[PDB]
Design a protein around this ligand. Sequence first.
Ligand SMILES: CCCCNC(=O)[C@H](C)C[C@H](O)[C@@H](N)CC(C)(C)CC(=O)N1C[C@H](C(=O)OC)Cc2ccccc21
Lengths: 333, 333, 333, 331, 331, 331
Amino acid sequence: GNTTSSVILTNYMDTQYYGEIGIGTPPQTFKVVFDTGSSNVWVPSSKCSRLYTACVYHKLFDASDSSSYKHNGTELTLRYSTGTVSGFLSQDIITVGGITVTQMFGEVTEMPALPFMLAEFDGVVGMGFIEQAIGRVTPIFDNIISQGVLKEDVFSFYYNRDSSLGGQIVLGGSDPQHYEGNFHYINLIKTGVWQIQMKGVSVGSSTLLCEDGCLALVDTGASYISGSTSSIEKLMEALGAKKRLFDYVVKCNEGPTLPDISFHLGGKEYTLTSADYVFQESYSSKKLCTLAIHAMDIPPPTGPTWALGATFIRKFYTEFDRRNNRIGFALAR
Amino acid sequence: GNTTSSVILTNYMDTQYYGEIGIGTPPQTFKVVFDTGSSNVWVPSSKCSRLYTACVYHKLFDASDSSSYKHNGTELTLRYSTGTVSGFLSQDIITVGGITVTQMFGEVTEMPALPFMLAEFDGVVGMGFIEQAIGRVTPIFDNIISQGVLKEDVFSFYYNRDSSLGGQIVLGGSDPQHYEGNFHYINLIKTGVWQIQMKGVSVGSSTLLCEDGCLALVDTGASYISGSTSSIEKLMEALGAKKRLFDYVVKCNEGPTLPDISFHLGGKEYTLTSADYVFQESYSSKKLCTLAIHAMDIPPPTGPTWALGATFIRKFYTEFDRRNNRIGFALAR
Amino acid sequence: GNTTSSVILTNYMDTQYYGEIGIGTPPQTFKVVFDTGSSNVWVPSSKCSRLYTACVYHKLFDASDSSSYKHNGTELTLRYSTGTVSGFLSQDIITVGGITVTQMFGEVTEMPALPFMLAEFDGVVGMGFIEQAIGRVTPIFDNIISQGVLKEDVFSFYYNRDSSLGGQIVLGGSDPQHYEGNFHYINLIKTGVWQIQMKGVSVGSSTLLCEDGCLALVDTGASYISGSTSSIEKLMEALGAKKRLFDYVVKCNEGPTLPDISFHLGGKEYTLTSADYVFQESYSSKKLCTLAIHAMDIPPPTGPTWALGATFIRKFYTEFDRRNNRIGFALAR
Amino acid sequence: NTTSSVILTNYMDTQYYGEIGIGTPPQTFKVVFDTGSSNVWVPSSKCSRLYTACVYHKLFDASDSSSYKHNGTELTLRYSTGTVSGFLSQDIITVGGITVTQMFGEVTEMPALPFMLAEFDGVVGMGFIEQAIGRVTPIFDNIISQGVLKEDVFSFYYNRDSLGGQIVLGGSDPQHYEGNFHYINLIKTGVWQIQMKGVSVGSSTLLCEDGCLALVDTGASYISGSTSSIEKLMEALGAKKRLFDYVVKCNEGPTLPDISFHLGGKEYTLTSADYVFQESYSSKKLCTLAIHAMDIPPPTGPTWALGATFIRKFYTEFDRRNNRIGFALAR
Amino acid sequence: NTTSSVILTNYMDTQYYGEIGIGTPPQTFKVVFDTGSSNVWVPSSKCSRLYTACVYHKLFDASDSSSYKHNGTELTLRYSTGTVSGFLSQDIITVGGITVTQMFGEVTEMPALPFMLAEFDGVVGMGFIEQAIGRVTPIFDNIISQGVLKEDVFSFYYNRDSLGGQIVLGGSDPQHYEGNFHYINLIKTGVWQIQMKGVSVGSSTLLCEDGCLALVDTGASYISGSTSSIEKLMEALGAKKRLFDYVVKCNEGPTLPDISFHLGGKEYTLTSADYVFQESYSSKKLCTLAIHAMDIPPPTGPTWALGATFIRKFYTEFDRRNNRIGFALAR
Amino acid sequence: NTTSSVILTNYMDTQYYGEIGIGTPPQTFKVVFDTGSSNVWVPSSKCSRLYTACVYHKLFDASDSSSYKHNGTELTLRYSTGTVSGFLSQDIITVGGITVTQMFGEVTEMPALPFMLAEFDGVVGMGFIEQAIGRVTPIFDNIISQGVLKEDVFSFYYNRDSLGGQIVLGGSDPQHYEGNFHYINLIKTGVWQIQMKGVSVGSSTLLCEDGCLALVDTGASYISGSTSSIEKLMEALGAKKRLFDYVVKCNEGPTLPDISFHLGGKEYTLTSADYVFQESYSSKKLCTLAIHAMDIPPPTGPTWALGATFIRKFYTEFDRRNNRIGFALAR
Ligand SMILES: CCCCNC(=O)[C@H](C)C[C@H](O)[C@@H](N)CC(C)(C)CC(=O)N1C[C@H](C(=O)OC)Cc2ccccc21
């Protein structure tokens, strides 16, 4: 085909990156994370009870104010690394980046506050495959590629650092104005899932971990780079950080000195320098700085897997290949 | 009539201002915000489940320990700017400031933690009109004025700054020992709602906003001065603050220098100096100070409306006129 | 008998102290607080909905993966000082410290986020008596003592300060390598509850409170030393601290100077020096330090009672006597 | 039967200002109320934006004001740290809830220093006419003639680093002091100065035995002394001049003497607390004291001037009937 | 049709470094890019762990690198604060997305001081060959011969205390400046120095009337001057040398002059903001300024050197075609 | 078969005290345990509240104590920073879990300075009898005669800025050291001092070549030296005396030498870390060092005294059988 498109995203604390789509005719405008870690679309409903406080706080979809809605009704529960949202299915037209498709998505009427009361975004747009789509509902990407319109079955992400542009996706391509050198692709391990083989993690200078090959899910809808508790713990122990309940942290004087960590994907080595991983808002002996790596256990559906989220993409411009099933990396500029 | 009365309130972080009432015979004592932004009375129930953690944390009303209770039973759901509480109706005698009335109020059995786990008060006393009373239940004020007892159908609020007196309401009047100059009244725009016409907001020195007339609900039960997201955003942009999810904030060195904001109500101009709006607990280049203005969207029931809460009353002693439907302002001393 | 045993615990912020047990055959491993303030065992279920976010975050018990489970099914709701958990009963073998017993415990399917989203532990092991066991379910201790195996019907706690060993329980005894001088016992006030008579609290140098005898529940599963709001308030007022919603706090320069507080239990006096009570992470005029005493109201089941939690045990190694119903104290080393 | 309080801002314990409206409808500005002078001045639009000080502070815009009443007589106002020069004009200034018509000055020349540091825009003098530059009738005098206040008095309260302070024109507010005041009489009308009979550092009358003068200034931050008496004192405090400011070590703070200003026949005492600025107790850091030398000139000065430092201590009441000053403990 | 940006780290506004890979597969290190020199050096495994500086920093390990190409000619590199000594070797260094083969040095002797304070491991010179120690062809020259860049240019952007900075080798990135540049021409090829025609503190050309030299160094943190001209300036700022560094009081910050570097026929101005390090506005504390004397030696030096301080101000473009430097406001 | 540890508080790394009970039922107070002296003293009710130091600290109230046993012989206790004067009395003091009867002093005259800075109430000497003022049998000697301890030994552990420290009377706790100790022998019984054979700043034996003395004081915060040797050292550290305390710049911290105390034939080394107080790495701020001159008098002093600074380093064991001191790395 020959259309190319991008949505443009907003970067929030480097921890949450959202763009906009419009459901419905008159469009309802919601803010959303474009997630390769799942395959479903949902936004909050008007039918959600406001005794859930997150629904008091995000925009809701009213469909009886939509000329193009179309009733469905099956229940659908989404489980994620880190919260469930439950709700029901519906269809209407959704506009992502000037491309309009009629997508089947979920209207959530149960929206847990933790974490969702802390989300600046409204829902989620899974960029995943049919395979991981609860309810076996076609996903936006597969639908846009039906439309015969893109010049390539590729979408790419640019995540920026923070305080113009917060990020950018491009559908049907890759803006070469935000990467350099070449791209390097790792073919998908099974398919119907963005999982890649990962050959080893070096902290400093040696394979402390990942050592006989592991899995690396490349996930845009994740903020941190994470691994199992068990190798998280270990990496942690090296680097020298404590546990504060949900994140590790180092004293900030120590900060600009943690070694580099490396990620060995296809004969290349993705290294992250200490600043790319620590959230330095001090350099002070008395104050705690947390790092951008975490523990997360994702179950055998697909995990155990290391997940490479924002930490990572923010350094390496990523393009996700459909035509060919693989992922490629190149250096963000 | 010729009684005058006041409750005396406690000021919490300048963000939450509560007094005490007693329901029931033997009184049960609950702490409450006196709210002109709504018209209903509710307190938590004993019948509330303690799996809602806010009910584990506030006092509950047991009515089978009340000689004067009187069964009702309709359900009633309260929606507010910022949380829902749901529950059922009941009647008992309520004592506000030495005046005893038998009021129909709600027993809440669903109490959302966010925000209510952070409330120092137990419930709410709407000071609003029958009109905005869910369930079309008479409100305390209308009942006290039935009692034939006040010398005037007026109540007034004094909110203090913080660390004696945290505030004070006076029923049937106004203590002139806490205002100066004269009062200035703005008549109520429609009636059955404390809404007034508001002619323009100046940040600095020019009408950046409110410009062709807007609405200003004067609300005692609100802590911040707020407007729609859309003009909030804009004011914000001027003044120079960021967004931290729920509030804006400025670096504190910048702090004692944000310009003044003005509120144009009836040919007078309500100005707030920078200190009246910023919560300065630092003056430091490295630390964030949040401001006392926020975004809040209140729906067409009554909003879009700017809401003038504590920020505002704390500077201008406010009296709310019943006899004559209007609001008057005077300078708190 | 002649076995003695200890579990070893982890100390988290001096505020939460957990050890490990294994339910089920293959063991499922959960982390738990050993609580003398209650008498029931529970851990989270797999059957818990993940729309409760605390269940997404703690390990769950699957029993259909347990060869030795045994179905029960009665509902059981646990109310505590500070949250409810609700769930259902089950039996399987539980291993505490190398001792294996088959215990009837609860599988929680409702787990409130606040507080449980902030708990590093998974459930609880009540060390209390049959008497306070909801559902009149035998407790682990009574079962282990059935097993005929301990040399004494005693368990003891060592809580450590913080950043080797975080703590230690010993079943059937007391490690003399962690106390000094002698032990001193206060016999249990009624029995079927760890409550002791408490003769007076001195702040500084005089009985400000507790003065005509009061109750002191000795509770390991509590972090702070607390009393009723009403005498908390008062003690507070002396010492000189404010209220921040849930804790009091003092300015930290003031910090290393609050007087000592004394606890008069059986002709001895338990004194706590200012550092044992304040959480000093500054000494600065501009910053707030909170203290390790709180208000808590526990209802007439057993309260009003002062509760002596971690604050206290951390200074005085405590042994709880079964054989003889009493409690003894000795100085932790 | 009136009284008018005005609420004050405290910026760092070093400046306390509050607000006024000049004009109709009123143009509002941050003013410092001083017992130090007698003239009212706010910055002017006619102020060149060449002066940063004028670029960054609010300007009075005269025709945006209906009561404006031209005068243009040129004024220079030399304080004891700062000349600003400008021109006389007229209007209504509303202070508290009072509404007065006064002659104020519109400044058009502001020094960056000291003023790019002031956080308020101007100054309101609570001083006599004798000290006014232009013998321009000041605002308390003008006010005291409307007949409305309840007393020819005006007090001050200033907080420690909440409120900030308050002026109560017309009387006092008891909510802020403890005790009953003691007055100490005006050494001569014209200036808010009294006679002080000995500054006793620590234990024994060290300095100023044998009287001297203390002006009482609501518009200064420190307790000032002349350079050398300051030297003598400090030498005694055990502090040393660092670079700028004298210093003592955090630790050392709590161990310092008390100074007591013998005055009026009663000894007014302050402590280490009271005069030292404790951003720490760190033996590892240095602490500033809130007492600074200030040599001011021959009629007024040479004199001690009891500033925010002393006022933070004792609530003050300036009294015009009796041309006396009272002091009670501030609370 | 290329360009290559490299992203920079800012440590305290005092050092900005970014990364490089030496080797195959590439061994990556934190480098400072300097207009100050012309040689590339990273620490060596052969560095004795006797030198802390070598114990704590990353070492180049040559046989862990297939392209390694021995040379061993001994180098000493004397900068204007720091000699490090080492030996010549070969390899491929990849910078941005470029991939070059260069002769770099493996240092084996590092001074603790200054280096146990550097946070990056080495240095990359963007200076001429004439200034290279060994007349060793530098990395921009080597690069400019692959034919790939889009222009014989390389610019710098450095943030205030987020990104940090960027080099854009080959051209400029507009996203970071406002305006159109003005060049000011190389006083003679060989060094990145220009002629400056007057440093005017505050209002009137105080110093350097009558030209002088300013080297433009991407690798220095401050604006340096010689000792006494620094003295003269500061004397004028009203600062005083404390112990180490000159100081001014927080308060006093915002009141200081502006310095403007007259150069190229255009006046390049900085302010108080621009040159003072404001960890406070506290009248109760002292503030460092980001301008420091630096006497450097006779051919190069004596000269002014416009460091991170000036670069933070004006985005820079070093231009090799035209052997000129451009400046636009940084944004 | 006993041992008795006592848990210590660390206030700023500058004081470590712990608790004692004097009386029946025991009246408990914060004491510093010193190897510096030999007498036990807590403040007295009979202390006049004229002395702030006595107003703010806990007082021993003798008849609130059944074992009280009057004596009234007047004591003055002159330390090397502080005389306090008082009177001898009797009672039972319980320390750890031991319960001893001793003669302590009830102080009635406390100096504000140094004491309005102490945070504990008194002092417990772990020194010999020879050094006791009154030749009053000290608490370790009295204790060592109940027959109960396991060894004529008592050690110390002090944390970096959690626990704080511990004394273990009777023996050592391995949980806090690594390694096996090495003793270095008492230059003469009477005092806890040894002979030190050279203080080598940085690399070469700079000072004290040719022996000198080091008292080992559990009750001092720093490593002290005499004034001029301190001068010589520091001069070498590159620090300068600021006002009070010597200073070095944050940045500069990590670059400083190591000092190593040659003693006992083994070299006891500390580093920059070890002796510098790093409230920052800011090149923008100044840092204090934990080594301070302290000229103490002719028999005892002149001598070096290895304080909290050195003890924080090496865990210490004072040994009375063998009248020797051991040191192992603290952990
Ligand atoms: C059932 C389909 C999902 C199965 N798989 C997963 O859940 C995978 C492994 C995780 C899934 O992609 C995650 N990243 C998507 C979510 C939305 C749950 C991530 C997530 O919760 N967030 C990511 C947002 C984000 O990181 O943007 C980059 C940040 C955030 C803020 C507040 C609440 C949630 C939230």
